[PDB]
Structure 1
């Protein structure tokens, strides 16, 4: 016998292989795995890792936020491993060249009409193998409603977690333990 942590087997955490059976996504994963292995760049390694991430970790990126992120380099390539969505709050958009998995068709039309162009990851690999002049971005990973119920339980002091309730009215989990008048608050 020997005294080792977990009998001496290194344990890794997270995704190991792509779960999706989308053949185009499998081809993309193979291409970028090869690129990351052969080319030394961390750019391709990051893209290969992000391509196999779950849906909740490929969050959408709005046109307005994408333009804001790309404001300080107008001639570079904005690459995201999520999907690009349109922002109606944005009055005008200009000259953005964006590589992404998906473009909502309204956002695609807006990008083309603004003079820019939309690229897929095969195009990005073909004409930017090492990610030169490419800035990779990602949308808000934990802005979705699920994380609003995570963290400290609602009922712990200073807890911002949303409870799971049928309705959000006056009669639904608002009386005791949520206001000082009825026993305690929070």
Structure 2
């Protein structure tokens, strides 16, 4: 016998390929597999790793946030592995070079009208093979409804986790355990 945990084998699971059946995504994965193998670029490795991620792990980026992050770097190609959505709270749109998996129609129209371009990852490979002069961006991963329910249980002290309730109102989980006048608070 040998004193090893699980015979020395790994017990962690990570994505090694996309779970999607999108043929275009598969072609992009092949392209960036080749790029990673034959260039050893950290940017390419990050792009390849993110190409495997699930939908919730590729959150969208708003146009206003994209403009804010690109301020002072309009000459660099901003790259996001995800979707870019329009923001009606953004008034002035500068000329930007943007690469993403997908653009909403409004966001694409606004970028093109402002004078930028919307690029795919094949075009990004053609333009910056090693990711030179790029601004790699990620959307807000934890900014979703499901996350609010995670963490410490609502009923424990110092917890601000949202509870699961079928309706909102005075009669829905507000009396005992939420007030000093009805039993205890928190």
TM superposition score category, shorter chain reference: over 0.9
Shift of 1:135: 1.1
Report how far residue 161 of structure 1 moved: 1.1
Deviation at 1:24, TM superposition (A): 0.4
SS at match of 1:55: coil
Q: CA deviation at 1:14?
A: 2.3
Determine helix, strand or coil for the equivalent of 1:50. helix
1:59-138 to structure 2, matched below 5 A, reads: 59-138=59-138
Runs of 4+ deviating beyond 2 Å: 10-14
Determine the C-alpha separation between the residues in 1 that align with 2:21 and 2:120.
19
TM-score relative to the length of structure 1: 0.97
Give TM-score, length-normalised by structure 2.
Answer: 0.97
1:17-56 deviation line (CA, Å, top 9, x unaligned): 2100010011111111111121111000000000110100
TM-aligned CA deviation for residue 147 of structure 1: 0.3
The answer for unaligned runs of 5 or more in structure 2 is none
Per-residue deviation, 1:10: 2.7
Residue of structure 1 equivalent to 2:53:
53
Write the distance in 1 (CA, Å) between the matches of 2:167 and 2:175: 14
Moved more, 106-115 or 172-181: 172-181
Residue 78 of structure 1 aligns to a residue whose secondary structure is strand
Greater Cα shift, 30-39 or 73-82? 30-39
Q: Could you say what secondary structure the match of 1:174 adopts?
A: coil
Inter-partner Cα distance in structure 2 for 1:3 and 1:183: 54
C-alpha separation in 2, matches of 1:114 and 1:20: 33
Per-residue CA distance 1:44-102 (angstroms, 9 max, x = gap) = 00000001101001101000000111112120000000100000011111111100000
Partner-residue secondary structure (3-state), 1:65? helix
**Aligned equivalents of 2:12 and 2:43: distance in 1?**
21
Rounded to whole Å, the distance in 2 between the matches of 1:107 and 1:169 is 38
Higher deviation after alignment, 12-21 or 40-49: 12-21
How many aligned residue pairs are there? 186
SS of 1:33's equivalent in the other structure is helix
For 2:160 and 2:38, locate their aligned partners in 1 and report how far apart those are by CA, in whole Å. Answer: 46
Q: What's the C-alpha RMSD, in Å, of the aligned pairs?
A: 0.9
SS in 2 for 1:28: helix
